[PDB]
Amino acid sequence: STGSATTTPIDSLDDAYITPVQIGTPAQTLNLDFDTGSSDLWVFSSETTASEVDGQTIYTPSKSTTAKLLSGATWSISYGDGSSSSGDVYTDTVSVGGLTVTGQAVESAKKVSSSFTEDSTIDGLLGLAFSTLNTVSPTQQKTFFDNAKASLDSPVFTADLGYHAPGTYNFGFIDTTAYTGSITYTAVSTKQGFWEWTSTGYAVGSGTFKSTSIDGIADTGTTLLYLPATVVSAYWAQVSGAKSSSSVGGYVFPCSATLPSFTFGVGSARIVIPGDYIDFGPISTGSSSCFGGIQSSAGIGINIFGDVALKAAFVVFNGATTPTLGFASK
Fold it and tell me: Tell me, which GO biological process terms does this entry list?
């Protein structure tokens, strides 16, 4: 089997991407944030505290003839941005772009934190990291990809995120028309539960490439590119007037600037992030100070190749017995 679904930016900045997902019988379609940095499929639901729902589409298990309560199971998760959610668990039929999993754990939110409530466009998350990170207790549950893998034509999914435009998640096949050149594969460590790999270095604009190992995670659920402070300083030093602002929370730059590109290494290959991809707009409405798309990881504990980086590439998440990551230009 295979599946193929379009993923769409939630706003004009590409702050996140939503993909339609069918849950239950008859289908209930919710728009989920596919997140290669986490491993829970959770949804706004009929059980969510009513004051914490503000425009989202909800899953109502009592209207699904295939929903079954997973007795005793609870979940609770906290994300790197400080947000969180928790609740109970059902199993139900879940389909993404024509690909169907029966018995998928659907984690129903009873509580969500304010940033979820405040984002009316995201109905939940669909985690695509390794199942060792799943938070269901006392019986840990598998991700959608893990459940589908054995049935797929090939044990892979691909992320093809657009810049200010829709893109595609495919399951079970590699669309050879979706990229240019060849795909360069690189080793993955699953020891922290992430799609963790080592970039071979970077360049700023037309500058020379610096060969240096950068361990980080491929995370579709993070908006920006978070890298070591030395790398980020070298980038923003090429932008007149750019500075790190403690009051804003990162590097800002004059909105009148033209930003240089940023290149990262994948083995001997190179992925080029155009300068425009690094512009996240005014810090507040009407301001002439703009927020940068490359930020320091110094306070996280891990480097994060988020959407800014991933949307410059066609990315293969290879779930073979020994997982690997593939990157191609497009």
Answer: proteolysis
Q: Which residues are catalytic?
A: 35, 199
165 and 192 assigned to the same domain = no
For 224-240, the DSSP string reads SEEE-HHHHHHHHTTST
Domain region containing 43: 5-174
Q: CATH number for the domain including 265?
A: 2.40.70.10
How many distinct structural domains can be found in the chain?
Answer: 2
Helix (H, G, I), strand (E, B) or coil at 214: strand
- The answer to whether 294 touches 236, Cβ cutoff 8 Å, is yes
165 plus 204 within the same structural domain:
no
Using CA atoms, how far apart are residues 308 and 280, in angstroms rounded to an integer?
A: 10
The alpha helices in 165-211, defined as continuous H runs, are none
Structure tokens at 79: 């994300």
Closest CA to 56 of 29, 37, 35: 29
Exp. method: X-ray
Tokens read off for 294: 């490359």
User: What is the distance between the alpha carbons of residues 191 and 174, in angstroms, rounded to a whole number?
Assistant: 26
* Cβ atoms of residues 180 and 328 within 8 Å: yes
For residues 291 and 280, is the Cβ–Cβ distance under 8 A?
yes
CA–CA separation, 96 and 53 (whole Å) = 24
